[PDB]
Design a protein around this ligand. Structure first.
Ligand code: 6DH
Ligand code: 6DH
Ligand code: 6DH
Lengths: 274, 274
């Protein structure tokens, strides 16, 4: 009874109370010889989305070249040629809500038009505030991630909450309804390894803002820093972050390893009484 | 600064503050044609103890036939022929403290004489109270596990704490020092699947007794009940229990999958600030 509403996603509806929601990460695998839409590139995305669906994903998060982990400099024009064909094919062939991982308003707009249901913004409407106008107009959920162009904090948690509020204000001023706001602490962004640990340790503070929280820690550098393990050897590390996140009240986890993290989340949910 | 003493284990000393301690599970693989001590049987145990050492174990827990998971009916005379050669070889070849997983006083005595450092009692000194006299005499740590010959609880957590106190009283009356007492909630013993979940959910209550807590959930039936997965597919499930246990303050985890659980524990420790 924590949430008195469900997350409305067009033809899909996500219950926020019954289980931790698993968002599976789908990064584009660009064909070297085309700008987008080619069979090998799109077929790869579809096959991967189907696998994640079969492994327990509730949302498929689709990211083009300009987003994490690559951060390529690419025009919205180029970005649309690549992202839109993926959204079209995945939305047709995979019966799950799709999030578009972009900070660019025009990309978000075209993605929603192509069939995406949720906007996932690593800059929390601060890089391109018009993304909040797009969100409001289409009445879609938007995930506002904590992020900064600096790591000069006075007090990490207090600053994160203040920064997240600045994002909330941008979204609400644009007309985004409270029920369409989700927050993300931005673990692995604009934070030292030590600061990432401190944010994990204090994640429950985000709950005072009164919005659902999505945690995205999967395979991130700070896990490698602790364990001294490369990106492919971080299942256990990611797992610990997912478990602690759920214990601290997060509603979503954004993960690469859907099969394993879905099992861990299900076990956590059972134990905490979710 | 939670603990103002270290766990003294003869030539070994375990710090209770710096990391979650990993106890690796070693079950005997009985040779069919002998009562104990044979090369294949003991070599198997030694090889396994070395692997667990290399994978991050801090304690090796050695169990003969009459203990979990098999619970064979076997005389102390038979049990000694099997357990003592394992302890002798493992203690010589593997530089870690050894716990003997037995509820039988005479087995515990001979095990300590053979080189074991810690007594691990699934009956918490209630099946054979003389085991507490053995513990006191040799001045070794003893793990008192919650257990009952029934599941008729009036109130699970309150009953567990009362039962654990009855074990503490037996141990202290026998002369066991406070610094040599460790408690275990007995997840998977004398509890319904639902009760096991409830005990996990409320594990932090055990901390009021003021003794270190060891959690032993590895691969247990209740994980299979939640996930509907067989014993070999419970890494993720065990992982969630380990993470939640550490968050709730446990000092030890008793696990089969040392490599994976050691990594998860290290990540948890870093995040909680242990
Ligand atoms: O300290 C808060 C920073 C907010 C912020 N506004 C930005 C605009 C553009 C970009 C860029 F375009 F990605 F470079 C990054 C930004 N970061
Ligand atoms: O309800 C608390 C039960 C305490 C208890 N005393 C026991 C003695 C012997 C055995 C046995 F020998 F293993 F059967 C099991 C026991 N259980
Ligand atoms: O399914 C992947 C192949 C087998 C496998 N390796 C694992 C490592 C760690 C964990 C973890 F402990 F749950 F994180 C689960 C795993 N399962």
């Amino acid at each position: 009874m924590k949430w008195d509403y469900d997350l409305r996603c067009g033809e899909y509806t996500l219950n926020l109370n019954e289980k931790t929601l698993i968002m599976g990460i789908l990064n584009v695998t660009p064909d070297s010889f085309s700008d987008g839409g080619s069979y090998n590139e799109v077929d790869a995305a579809v096959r991967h989305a189907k696998e994640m669906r079969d492994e327990g994903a509730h949302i498929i998060d689709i990211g083009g070249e300009s987003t994490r982990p690559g951060f390529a400099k690419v025009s919205v024009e180029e970005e649309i040629k690549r992202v839109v064909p993926m959204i079209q094919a995945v939305s047709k062939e995979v019966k799950l809500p799709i999030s578009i991982d972009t900070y660019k308003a025009e990309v978000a707009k075209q993605a929603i038009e192509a069939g995406a249901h949720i906007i996932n913004d690593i800059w929390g409407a601060k890089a391109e505030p018009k993304i909040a106008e797009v969100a409001a107009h289409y009445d879609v959920p938007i995930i506002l991630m904590h992020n900064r162009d600096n790591m000069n904090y006075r007090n990490l948690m207090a600053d994160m909450i203040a920064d997240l509020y600045d994002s909330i204000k941008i979204a609400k001023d644009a007309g985004v309804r409270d029920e369409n706001i989700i927050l993300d602490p931005g673990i692995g962004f604009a934070k030292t390894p030590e600061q990432n640990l401190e944010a994990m340790r204090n994640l429950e503070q985000l709950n005072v803002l009164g919005y659902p929280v999505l945690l995205g820690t999967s395979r991130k550098s700070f896990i490698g820093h602790v364990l001294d393990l490369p990106v492919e050897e971080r299942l256990e590390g990611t797992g610990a972050t997912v478990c602690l996140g759920i214990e601290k009240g997060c509603e979503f986890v954004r993960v690469h390893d859907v099969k394993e993290m879905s099992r861990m989340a299900k076990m956590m949910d059972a134990m905490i009484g979710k």
